[PDB]
Short mmCIF file of N, CA and C in Angstrom, two decimals:
data_model
loop_
_atom_site.label_atom_id
_atom_site.label_comp_id
_atom_site.label_asym_id
_atom_site.label_seq_id
_atom_site.Cartn_x
_atom_site.Cartn_y
_atom_site.Cartn_z
N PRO N 9 112.39 109.21 86.97
CA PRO N 9 112.43 110.17 88.09
C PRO N 9 112.50 111.63 87.65
N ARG N 10 112.00 112.52 88.52
CA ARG N 10 112.01 113.97 88.33
C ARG N 10 113.15 114.60 89.13
N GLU N 11 113.78 115.62 88.56
CA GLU N 11 114.91 116.25 89.24
C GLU N 11 114.43 116.96 90.51
N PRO N 12 115.18 116.87 91.61
CA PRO N 12 114.82 117.66 92.80
C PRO N 12 115.00 119.15 92.54
N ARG N 13 114.27 119.95 93.32
CA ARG N 13 114.25 121.40 93.17
C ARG N 13 114.35 122.06 94.53
N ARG N 14 114.96 123.24 94.55
CA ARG N 14 115.01 124.08 95.73
C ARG N 14 113.85 125.07 95.69
N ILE N 15 113.12 125.17 96.79
CA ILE N 15 112.03 126.12 96.94
C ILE N 15 112.29 126.90 98.22
N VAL N 16 112.27 128.22 98.13
CA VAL N 16 112.45 129.09 99.28
C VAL N 16 111.13 129.77 99.57
N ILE N 17 110.61 129.58 100.78
CA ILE N 17 109.38 130.25 101.17
C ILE N 17 109.57 130.95 102.50
N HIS N 18 108.72 131.93 102.74
CA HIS N 18 108.75 132.74 103.95
C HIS N 18 107.52 132.46 104.79
N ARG N 19 107.76 132.22 106.08
CA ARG N 19 106.70 131.89 107.00
C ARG N 19 105.76 133.07 107.16
N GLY N 20 104.48 132.76 107.33
CA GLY N 20 103.48 133.79 107.50
C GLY N 20 102.69 133.48 108.75
N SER N 21 101.55 134.15 108.94
CA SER N 21 100.75 133.94 110.14
C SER N 21 100.11 132.56 110.18
N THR N 22 99.97 131.90 109.02
CA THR N 22 99.46 130.53 108.99
C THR N 22 100.57 129.56 108.59
N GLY N 23 101.74 129.71 109.21
CA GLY N 23 102.89 128.90 108.87
C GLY N 23 103.29 128.92 107.41
N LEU N 24 103.76 127.78 106.93
CA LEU N 24 104.26 127.63 105.58
C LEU N 24 103.17 127.30 104.57
N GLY N 25 101.98 126.91 105.03
CA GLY N 25 100.86 126.73 104.13
C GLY N 25 100.77 125.39 103.44
N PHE N 26 101.22 124.32 104.09
CA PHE N 26 101.06 122.98 103.54
C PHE N 26 101.00 122.01 104.70
N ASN N 27 100.50 120.82 104.42
CA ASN N 27 100.48 119.77 105.42
C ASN N 27 101.23 118.58 104.83
N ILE N 28 101.69 117.68 105.71
CA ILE N 28 102.52 116.55 105.33
C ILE N 28 101.94 115.26 105.90
N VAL N 29 102.24 114.17 105.21
CA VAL N 29 101.92 112.81 105.64
C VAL N 29 103.20 112.00 105.46
N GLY N 30 103.16 110.77 105.94
CA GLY N 30 104.29 109.85 105.76
C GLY N 30 105.23 109.84 106.95
N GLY N 31 106.46 109.42 106.67
CA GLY N 31 107.46 109.36 107.72
C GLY N 31 107.41 108.10 108.54
N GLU N 32 106.85 107.03 107.99
CA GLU N 32 106.71 105.75 108.68
C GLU N 32 106.76 104.63 107.64
N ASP N 33 107.19 103.45 108.08
CA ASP N 33 107.10 102.24 107.28
C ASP N 33 107.81 102.39 105.93
N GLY N 34 108.91 103.15 105.91
CA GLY N 34 109.66 103.36 104.69
C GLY N 34 109.07 104.39 103.75
N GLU N 35 107.90 104.94 104.06
CA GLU N 35 107.35 106.08 103.35
C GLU N 35 108.01 107.38 103.81
N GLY N 36 108.50 108.16 102.85
CA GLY N 36 109.06 109.46 103.12
C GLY N 36 108.00 110.49 103.52
N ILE N 37 108.45 111.74 103.61
CA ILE N 37 107.59 112.85 103.99
C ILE N 37 107.02 113.45 102.70
N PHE N 38 105.70 113.43 102.58
CA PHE N 38 105.02 113.91 101.38
C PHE N 38 104.08 115.06 101.70
N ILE N 39 104.01 116.00 100.77
CA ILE N 39 103.02 117.07 100.81
C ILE N 39 101.67 116.50 100.41
N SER N 40 100.69 116.65 101.30
CA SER N 40 99.32 116.16 101.14
C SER N 40 98.29 117.26 100.93
N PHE N 41 98.66 118.52 101.13
CA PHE N 41 97.71 119.62 101.11
C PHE N 41 98.48 120.92 100.94
N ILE N 42 97.96 121.79 100.06
CA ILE N 42 98.47 123.14 99.88
C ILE N 42 97.35 124.10 100.26
N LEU N 43 97.60 124.96 101.24
CA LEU N 43 96.61 125.96 101.62
C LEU N 43 96.53 127.06 100.57
N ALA N 44 95.33 127.32 100.06
CA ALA N 44 95.16 128.34 99.04
C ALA N 44 95.63 129.69 99.57
N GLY N 45 96.47 130.37 98.79
CA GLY N 45 96.94 131.69 99.15
C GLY N 45 98.12 131.72 100.08
N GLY N 46 98.56 130.57 100.58
CA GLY N 46 99.67 130.52 101.50
C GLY N 46 101.01 130.49 100.80
N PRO N 47 102.08 130.51 101.60
CA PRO N 47 103.43 130.58 101.01
C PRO N 47 103.74 129.44 100.06
N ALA N 48 103.43 128.20 100.43
CA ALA N 48 103.68 127.09 99.53
C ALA N 48 102.89 127.25 98.24
N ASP N 49 101.62 127.63 98.35
CA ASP N 49 100.80 127.84 97.17
C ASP N 49 101.42 128.87 96.24
N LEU N 50 101.83 130.01 96.79
CA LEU N 50 102.33 131.12 95.97
C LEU N 50 103.77 130.94 95.50
N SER N 51 104.43 129.84 95.89
CA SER N 51 105.74 129.51 95.35
C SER N 51 105.67 129.10 93.89
N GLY N 52 104.50 128.63 93.45
CA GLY N 52 104.33 128.10 92.12
C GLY N 52 105.09 126.82 91.87
N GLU N 53 105.61 126.18 92.92
CA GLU N 53 106.45 125.01 92.74
C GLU N 53 105.98 123.83 93.59
N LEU N 54 105.79 124.05 94.89
CA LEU N 54 105.40 122.95 95.77
C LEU N 54 103.99 122.46 95.45
N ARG N 55 103.80 121.14 95.53
CA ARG N 55 102.53 120.55 95.14
C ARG N 55 102.35 119.23 95.87
N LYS N 56 101.08 118.81 95.98
CA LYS N 56 100.76 117.50 96.51
C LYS N 56 101.51 116.44 95.71
N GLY N 57 102.12 115.50 96.41
CA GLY N 57 102.93 114.48 95.79
C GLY N 57 104.41 114.76 95.79
N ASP N 58 104.82 115.97 96.14
CA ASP N 58 106.23 116.23 96.39
C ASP N 58 106.69 115.48 97.64
N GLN N 59 107.85 114.83 97.54
CA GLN N 59 108.55 114.38 98.73
C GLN N 59 109.50 115.47 99.21
N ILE N 60 109.43 115.78 100.50
CA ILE N 60 110.35 116.74 101.11
C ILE N 60 111.63 115.99 101.46
N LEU N 61 112.71 116.30 100.73
CA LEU N 61 113.96 115.61 100.98
C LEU N 61 114.75 116.27 102.10
N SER N 62 114.66 117.59 102.23
CA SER N 62 115.39 118.30 103.26
C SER N 62 114.73 119.65 103.53
N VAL N 63 114.97 120.15 104.74
CA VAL N 63 114.52 121.46 105.19
C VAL N 63 115.72 122.16 105.82
N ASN N 64 116.13 123.28 105.23
CA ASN N 64 117.31 124.01 105.69
C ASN N 64 118.52 123.08 105.86
N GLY N 65 118.67 122.13 104.94
CA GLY N 65 119.78 121.19 105.00
C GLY N 65 119.58 119.97 105.89
N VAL N 66 118.53 119.94 106.70
CA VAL N 66 118.26 118.79 107.56
C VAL N 66 117.66 117.68 106.71
N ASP N 67 118.30 116.53 106.70
CA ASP N 67 117.85 115.42 105.86
C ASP N 67 116.57 114.82 106.43
N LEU N 68 115.52 114.75 105.62
CA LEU N 68 114.26 114.17 106.06
C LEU N 68 113.90 112.90 105.33
N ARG N 69 114.83 112.31 104.57
CA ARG N 69 114.48 111.14 103.78
C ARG N 69 114.00 109.99 104.66
N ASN N 70 114.56 109.85 105.85
CA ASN N 70 114.23 108.74 106.73
C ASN N 70 113.67 109.21 108.06
N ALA N 71 113.24 110.46 108.14
CA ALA N 71 112.74 111.05 109.38
C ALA N 71 111.30 110.63 109.66
N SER N 72 110.93 110.65 110.95
CA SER N 72 109.55 110.42 111.35
C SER N 72 108.69 111.65 111.05
N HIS N 73 107.37 111.45 111.09
CA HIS N 73 106.45 112.56 110.84
C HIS N 73 106.66 113.68 111.85
N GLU N 74 106.81 113.32 113.13
CA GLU N 74 107.06 114.33 114.15
C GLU N 74 108.39 115.04 113.92
N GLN N 75 109.44 114.29 113.58
CA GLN N 75 110.72 114.93 113.28
C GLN N 75 110.58 115.94 112.15
N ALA N 76 109.82 115.60 111.10
CA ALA N 76 109.65 116.51 109.98
C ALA N 76 108.89 117.76 110.39
N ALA N 77 107.79 117.57 111.14
CA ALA N 77 107.02 118.69 111.63
C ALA N 77 107.88 119.62 112.49
N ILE N 78 108.72 119.04 113.36
CA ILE N 78 109.62 119.85 114.17
C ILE N 78 110.64 120.57 113.30
N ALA N 79 111.19 119.88 112.31
CA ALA N 79 112.13 120.54 111.41
C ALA N 79 111.49 121.74 110.72
N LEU N 80 110.25 121.59 110.24
CA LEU N 80 109.56 122.70 109.59
C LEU N 80 109.30 123.84 110.56
N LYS N 81 108.90 123.52 111.79
CA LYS N 81 108.63 124.56 112.79
C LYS N 81 109.88 125.34 113.17
N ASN N 82 111.00 124.65 113.30
CA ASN N 82 112.24 125.26 113.76
C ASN N 82 113.06 125.86 112.63
N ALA N 83 112.57 125.83 111.39
CA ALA N 83 113.32 126.33 110.25
C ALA N 83 113.37 127.85 110.17
N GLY N 84 112.62 128.55 111.02
CA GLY N 84 112.68 129.99 111.09
C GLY N 84 111.79 130.69 110.09
N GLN N 85 112.13 131.96 109.86
CA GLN N 85 111.29 132.78 108.99
C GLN N 85 111.52 132.45 107.52
N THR N 86 112.74 132.07 107.14
CA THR N 86 113.08 131.75 105.75
C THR N 86 113.39 130.26 105.63
N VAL N 87 112.57 129.54 104.88
CA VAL N 87 112.61 128.09 104.83
C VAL N 87 112.98 127.62 103.43
N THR N 88 114.08 126.87 103.34
CA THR N 88 114.60 126.35 102.08
C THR N 88 114.32 124.85 102.03
N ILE N 89 113.42 124.47 101.13
CA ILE N 89 112.98 123.09 100.99
C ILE N 89 113.61 122.51 99.74
N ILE N 90 114.18 121.31 99.85
CA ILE N 90 114.49 120.50 98.68
C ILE N 90 113.37 119.47 98.53
N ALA N 91 112.72 119.49 97.39
CA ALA N 91 111.59 118.62 97.12
C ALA N 91 111.75 117.95 95.76
N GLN N 92 111.17 116.76 95.66
CA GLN N 92 111.20 115.97 94.44
C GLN N 92 109.79 115.44 94.22
N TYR N 93 109.24 115.74 93.04
CA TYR N 93 107.88 115.33 92.72
C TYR N 93 107.88 113.83 92.44
N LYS N 94 107.11 113.07 93.22
CA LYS N 94 107.10 111.61 93.16
C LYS N 94 105.66 111.12 93.21
N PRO N 95 104.88 111.43 92.17
CA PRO N 95 103.44 111.13 92.20
C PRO N 95 103.13 109.65 92.23
N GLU N 96 103.98 108.83 91.61
CA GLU N 96 103.69 107.39 91.58
C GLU N 96 103.74 106.82 93.00
N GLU N 97 104.79 107.12 93.76
CA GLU N 97 104.89 106.64 95.14
C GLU N 97 103.85 107.28 96.04
N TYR N 98 103.67 108.60 95.91
CA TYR N 98 102.69 109.26 96.75
C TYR N 98 101.35 108.57 96.66
N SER N 99 100.91 108.27 95.43
CA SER N 99 99.59 107.70 95.25
C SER N 99 99.51 106.32 95.89
N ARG N 100 100.60 105.55 95.80
CA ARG N 100 100.61 104.21 96.38
C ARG N 100 100.46 104.25 97.89
N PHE N 101 101.02 105.26 98.54
CA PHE N 101 100.99 105.34 99.99
C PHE N 101 99.76 106.07 100.53
N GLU N 102 99.13 106.94 99.74
CA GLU N 102 98.07 107.81 100.27
C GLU N 102 96.74 107.69 99.53
#
């Protein structure tokens, strides 16, 4: 396993700049897309295959896709993500 990391990003006109999949059937919330030039991209940390463990302290390990999307939307202008790179699982699910 890879150590989890804290990433702080700031919302822009195109949101946080990533898309998510998962949140069903025991699959966690995974980053599936990084928008070029967006906040997630320019963090130098977030990447496809990261599992989002929490957003502003809200636990997303067992959350639904809609719950995660709502958590990201309601996180405000400054968004603190705990993420763990899990490429082996990501690939199995996606």
